[PDB]
Design a protein around this ligand. Structure first.
Ligand SMILES: O=C(NC/C=C/[C@H]1OC[C@H](O)[C@@H]1O)c1cc([N+](=O)[O-])cc(O)c1O
Ligand SMILES: [Cl-]
Ligand SMILES: [Mg+2]
Length: 213
């Protein structure tokens, strides 16, 4: 029995099936009151929600599903016909994420990719019928944010106006990524100050909008 399985079970026992908001609320309750876990959380989540609503993306890539909290958060705001692809390196987590989405009634909008980002990114266009991405959410290994951004760019997955939105740029931090995007004329960056999930520690999201080569 793992922490992640306990979260899934709590959602199954307490949330309303087919109600994404209820699923988010049960996850946030469990992680607030019983066991901390690395979900984006409600405070950063509201900022995510605002960004998604602003850009109305048709095709979103998530790096790092975990338990599917952000997958649920994002997919519930997607317009009909829009798609979320989410990459998860751990097969236990990838299974839990599928179950979370199923419960929420979002399975039709979301496609889970099991594998390492660096291995899956070059297969997106051909295997998943992708031209360019409208939005990318980065929440996987923090040392992978920069090299996976360079890989997205190499593989032709970014277009002018693709929105990159990165969690944990302060805590635990992604200092190479943040230096890079903020220094590059290919990115226009905005910082959204917030708090680390379930805590009083300052963290933030960075939005980096790709400008072209
Ligand atoms: O390592 C973090 N995320 C990367 C984890 C990536 C993989 O580990 C478990 C699962 O397989 C996931 O895809 C992290 C860590 C903290 N933290 O405070 O440690 C807060 C966060 O929001 C995080 O995303
Ligand atoms: Cl999450
Ligand atoms: Mg995170």
């Amino acid at each position: 029995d793992t922490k992640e399985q306990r979260i899934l079970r709590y959602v199954q026992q307490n949330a309303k099936p087919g109600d994404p908001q209820s699923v988010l609320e049960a996850i946030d309750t469990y992680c607030t009151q019983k066991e901390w876990a690395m979900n984006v959380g409600d405070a950063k989540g509201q900022i995510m929600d605002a960004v998604i609503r602003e850009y109305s993306p048709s095709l979103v890539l998530e790096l790092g599903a975990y338990c599917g909290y952000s997958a649920v958060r994002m997919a519930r705001l997607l317009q009909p016909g829009a798609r979320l692809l989410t990459m998860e390196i751990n097969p236990d987590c990838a299974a839990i994420t599928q179950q979370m989405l199923n419960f929420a009634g979002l399975q039709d909008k979301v496609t889970i990719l099991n594998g390492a980002s660096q291995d899956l990114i070059p297969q997106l266009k051909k295997k998943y019928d992708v031209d360019t991405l409208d939005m990318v959410f980065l929440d996987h290994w923090k040392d992978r944010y920069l090299p996976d951004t360079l890989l997205l760019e190499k593989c032709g997955l970014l277009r002018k106006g693709t929105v990159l939105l990165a969690d944990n740029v302060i805590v635990p931090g992604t200092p190479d990524f943040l230096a890079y995007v903020r220094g590059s004329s290919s990115f226009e960056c905005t910082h959204y100050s917030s708090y680390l999930e379930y805590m009083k520690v300052v963290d933030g999201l960075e939005k980096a909008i790709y400008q072209g080569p």
